[PDB]
Amino acid sequence: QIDGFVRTLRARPEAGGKVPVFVFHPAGGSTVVYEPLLGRLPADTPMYGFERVEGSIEERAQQYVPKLIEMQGDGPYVLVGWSLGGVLAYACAIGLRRLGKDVRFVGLIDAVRAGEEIPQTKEEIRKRWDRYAAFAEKTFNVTIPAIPYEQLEELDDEGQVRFVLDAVSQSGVQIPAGIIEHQRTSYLDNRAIDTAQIQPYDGHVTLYMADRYHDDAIMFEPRYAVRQPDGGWGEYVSDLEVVPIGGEHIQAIDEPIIAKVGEHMSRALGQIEADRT
Numbered sequence: 059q060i061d062g063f064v065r066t067l068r069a070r071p072e073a074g075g076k077v078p079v080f081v082f083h084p085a086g087g088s089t090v091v092y093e094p095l096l097g098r099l100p101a102d103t104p105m106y107g108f109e110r111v112e113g114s115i116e117e118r119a120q121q122y123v124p125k126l127i128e129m130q131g132d133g134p135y136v137l138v139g140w141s142l143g144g145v146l147a148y149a150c151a152i153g154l155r156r157l158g159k160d161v162r163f164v165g166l167i168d169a170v171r172a173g174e175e176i177p178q179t180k181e182e183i184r185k186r187w188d189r190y191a192a193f194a195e196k197t198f199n200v201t202i203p204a205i206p207y208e209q210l211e212e213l214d215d216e217g218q219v220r221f222v223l224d225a226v227s228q229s230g231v232q233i234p235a236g237i238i239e240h241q242r243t244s245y246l247d248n249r250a251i252d253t254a255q256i257q258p259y260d261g262h263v264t265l266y267m268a269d270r271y272h273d274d275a276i277m278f279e280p281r282y283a284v285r286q287p288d289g290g291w292g293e294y295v296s297d298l299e300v301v302p303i304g305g306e307h308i309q310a311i312d313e314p315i316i317a318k319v320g321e322h323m324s325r326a327l328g329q330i331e332a333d334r335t
């Protein structure tokens with residue numbers, strides 16, 4: 059049921075049966091979030107979830123791709139993800155295609171680019187932590203002294219966090235390690251997206267598009283306030299289908315909206331199963 063980074067949500071039969079759906083975790087969550095979707099897919103659809111690993115998006119896909127091949131061979135591959143999971147699913151479709159495997163479906167559940175690129179600069183690192191420090195002033199009713207920008211500016215996202223957590227530990231506050239893990243992993247996993255090196259894909263992608271990012275995403279990164287109609291994918295994906303679903307990014311994975319995703323996806327899986335049979 060949990061084997062390394064692979065969660066079994068519905069086991070495939072010992073032999074034969076329908077094409078599995080591989081789902082990839084969101085930042086801060088596990089693949090149990092795909093249970094509602096599973097309920098709106100056809101009976102006996104197998105489903106396996108890929109849980110977090112470390113590295114860049116490319117490095118994470120380098121860990122997943124071998125495991126995908128161990129599980130499902132030449133194909134067909136059906137890859138699905140919400141939020142960061144959608145970025146991970148796509149990265150896997152690229153890795154699999156370079157190895158000549160047969161990718162038939164890539165379903166992105168509101169995996170939408172920031173409305174403009176997030177600069178990877180020292181100035182942007184300073185601005186981002188100034189915003190974060192101001193929120194923390196308000197929230198924890200404190201004054202924050204001068205941020206040690208020289209220190210933070212040379213560190214990766216991970217380093218920036220551990221530095222900030224070492225400095226919070228330093229004075230006063232002892233945080234439950236479970237709270238720290240959860241906040242640190244959510245934060246780093248969502249930041250890994252900003253430097254994804256998106257490659258062109260030659261197959262069909264389906265983007266389930268909500269109306270907007272929710273407020274906490276915008277707080278994390280204000281460029282999520284704007285989105286383009288193709289969610290940023292059009293330059294990389296010639297064969298791009300968008301399925302508007304409405305609502306907010308945070309709601310897209312849950313009932314009732316997931317009913318709309320599953321209905322559409324069920325027809326795509328049906329077509330795939332007919333094309334083999």
Ligand SMILES: COc1ccc(-c2noc(C(=O)NCCc3ccc(C(=O)N4CCC4)cc3)n2)cc1OC
Nearest residue numbers: 141142169170171251252254256274275278290291
């Ligand atoms: C073509 O290039 C791209 C296409 C798509 C995306 C992309 N796809 O999905 C996302 C995404 O899901 N981003 C995180 C959004 C988020 C969600 C929750 C919280 C959240 O609620 N919180 C943080 C703590 C609370 C924050 C941010 N980005 C990126 C691309 O290039 C980089």
